[PDB]
Amino acid sequence: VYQEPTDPKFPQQWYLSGVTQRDLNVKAAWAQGYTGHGIVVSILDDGIEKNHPDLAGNYDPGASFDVNDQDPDPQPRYTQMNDNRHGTRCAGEVAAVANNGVCGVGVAYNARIGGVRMLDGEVTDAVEARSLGLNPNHIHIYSASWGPEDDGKTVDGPARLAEEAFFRGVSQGRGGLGSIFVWASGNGGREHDSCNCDGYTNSIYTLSISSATQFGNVPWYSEACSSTLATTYSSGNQNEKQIVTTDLRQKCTESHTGTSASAPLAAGIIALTLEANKNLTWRDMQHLVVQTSKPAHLNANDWATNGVGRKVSHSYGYGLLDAGAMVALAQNWTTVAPQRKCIIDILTEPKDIGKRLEVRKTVTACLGEPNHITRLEHAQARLTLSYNRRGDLAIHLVSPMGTRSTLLAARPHDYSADGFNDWAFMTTHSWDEDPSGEWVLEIENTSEANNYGTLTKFTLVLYGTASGSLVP
Numbered sequence: 001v002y003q004e005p006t007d008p009k010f011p012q013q014w015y016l017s018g019v020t021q022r023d024l025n026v027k028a029a030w031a032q033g034y035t036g037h038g039i040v041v042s043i044l045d046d047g048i049e050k051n052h053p054d055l056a057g058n059y060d061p062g063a064s065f066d067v068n069d070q071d072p073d074p075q076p077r078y079t080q081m082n083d084n085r086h087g088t089r090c091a092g093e094v095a096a097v098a099n100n101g102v103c104g105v106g107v108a109y110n111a112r113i114g115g116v117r118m119l120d121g122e123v124t125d126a127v128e129a130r131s132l133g134l135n136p137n138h139i140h141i142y143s144a145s146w147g148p149e150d151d152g153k154t155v156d157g158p159a160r161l162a163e164e165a166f167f168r169g170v171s172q173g174r175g176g177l178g179s180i181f182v183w184a185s186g187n188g189g190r191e192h193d194s195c196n197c198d199g200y201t202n203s204i205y206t207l208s209i210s211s212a213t214q215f216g217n218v219p220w221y222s223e224a225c226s227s228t229l230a231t232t233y234s235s236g237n238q239n240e241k242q243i244v245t246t247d248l249r250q251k252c253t254e255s256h257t258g259t260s261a262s263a264p265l266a267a268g269i270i271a272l273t274l275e276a277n278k279n280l281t282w283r284d285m286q287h288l289v290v291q292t293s294k295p296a297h298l299n300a301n302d303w304a305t306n307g308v309g310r311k312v313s314h315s316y317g318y319g320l321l322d323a324g325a326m327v328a329l330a331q332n333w334t335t336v337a338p339q340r341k342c343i344i345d346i347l348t349e350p351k352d353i354g355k356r357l358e359v360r361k362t363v364t365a366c367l368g369e370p371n372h373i374t375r376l377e378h379a380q381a382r383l384t385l386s387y388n389r390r391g392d393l394a395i396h397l398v399s400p401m402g403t404r405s406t407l408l409a410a411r412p413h414d415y416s417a418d419g420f421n422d423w424a425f426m427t428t429h430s431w432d433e434d435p436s437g438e439w440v441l442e443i444e445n446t447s448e449a450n451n452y453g454t455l456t457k458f459t460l461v462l463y464g465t466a467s468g469s470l471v472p
């Protein structure tokens with residue numbers, strides 16, 4: 001009979017286990033015998049306190065490096081401000097030791113945990129690449145919340161070395177099964193940011209996670225976008241509890257916060273899942289998340305049912321992660337077929353945007369070809385356009401099954417005149433839909449200003465397979 005952890009702060013870890021059912025259902029996974037044994041997770045951040053009394057027992061130097069100083073030791077740089085505590089906080093979320101009379105427990109409290117010190121210095125493309133590409137046949141799961149500053153006016157993603165690291169990771173990482181890159185969707189809610197403008201979370205190669213408050217609401221810091229897959233609990237207002245974890249200087253904290261605290265919890269759940277089936281590919285893991293995640297009691301004004309009957313939100317993706325359901329579905333999971341990629345160049349001539357532009361196109365999704373797709377995974381609308389004030393644009397994409405994805409919401413602080421240069425807006429909301437038929441792209445000026453510009457390229461890129469569907 002499974003006995004839950006006795007750690008002093010475990011009762012404060014409301015998101016792990018509750019009578020309330022406002023939790024991630026992690027205890028059910030533990031009771032099935034999955035606690036993360038044999039799985040390796042790395043926190044890509046500001047370092048890890050490897051001698052922390054609640055981390056030392058699970059610490060793995062093979063999951064660690066210091067890319068800022070170019071040496072193996074990921075110890076945080078100690079300062080009066082305690083600036084470099086974040087990675088240590090995230091590590092504890094994943095893999096804090098259980099039943100040791102110290103603090104709380106990790107989601108995967110028998111997993112091995114390391115950290116990369118890479119944010120404490122100048123973060124170049126090369127630094128990002130070397131962090132993403134750290135020991136990819138030892139580390140199973142990476143967790144990160146970096147990328148562009150979420151100031152609501154930036155459009156930025158991985159440069160060439162980092163993008164190459166992503167493709168190398170998912171292709172040859174983890175014995176060919178693919179590195180699992182878990183990402184926080186962003187924290188620019190206050191600046192009205194729209195997270196598809198962040199190429200790291202907008203990537204198909206990252207498994208992107210947003211936040212819900214304890215009372216099941218969309219936190220002030222949250223960013224909505226179509227690229228997000230799912231949600232874990234994090235902080236909210238001052239009546240709502242927060243994340244309880246390991247802190248710098250061998251301390252315990254009850255006030256870890258933000259979307260950056262949601263990603264590590266997801267990484268821990270994904271570790272439990274990988275323990276339940278070590279053969280899951282990077283794409284398998286995303287399927288599991290889509291199928292098992294739970295909308296219930298998450299409050300949003302944009303819940304919509306897609307073409308295969310699943311509820312999806314731009315704030316929450318497919319909903320709250322469910323660890324028990326993940327590990328259950330993982331055990332007899334059949335590996336998905338090889339990924340197909342159908343490239344459809346939509347325009348025959350450039351199109352004036354004006355006040356509103358609608359582009360309709362009926363596609364066959366590579367019928368008759370080896371990239372024929374009847375089961376969609378990710379879809380991208382890769383857009384090249386000029387515009388005089390970028391943040392006034394809102395962009396939507398409607399699938400043949402009638403699923404309306406917001407690719408871009410108005411960003412009031414984005415006054416850029418640089419437009420978009422083949423930016424690959426991505427949506428997860430049409431997952432498992434048949435993409436044959438009429439797609440609709442909508443671009444609109446949300447302001448009353450006389451704005452102007454031209455859409456010069458629209459590539460619809462479809463990823464997925466042609467086999468093995470479930471009944472909706």
Ligand SMILES: [Ca+2]
Nearest residue numbers: 007097102104
């Ligand atoms: Ca502990």
Ligand SMILES: [Cl-]
Nearest residue numbers: 167341461463
């Ligand atoms: Cl590709």
Ligand code: NA
Nearest residue numbers: 066069073074
């Ligand atoms: Na170091």
Ligand code: NA
Nearest residue numbers: 145146147186
């Ligand atoms: Na970020």
Ligand code: NA
Nearest residue numbers: 145146147260
């Ligand atoms: Na960040």
Ligand code: NA
Nearest residue numbers: 156157158159
């Ligand atoms: Na960049």
Ligand code: NA
Nearest residue numbers: 171172176177
């Ligand atoms: Na591969």
Ligand code: NA
Nearest residue numbers: 201203206208
């Ligand atoms: Na992503």
Ligand code: NA
Nearest residue numbers: 400435436437
């Ligand atoms: Na169709």
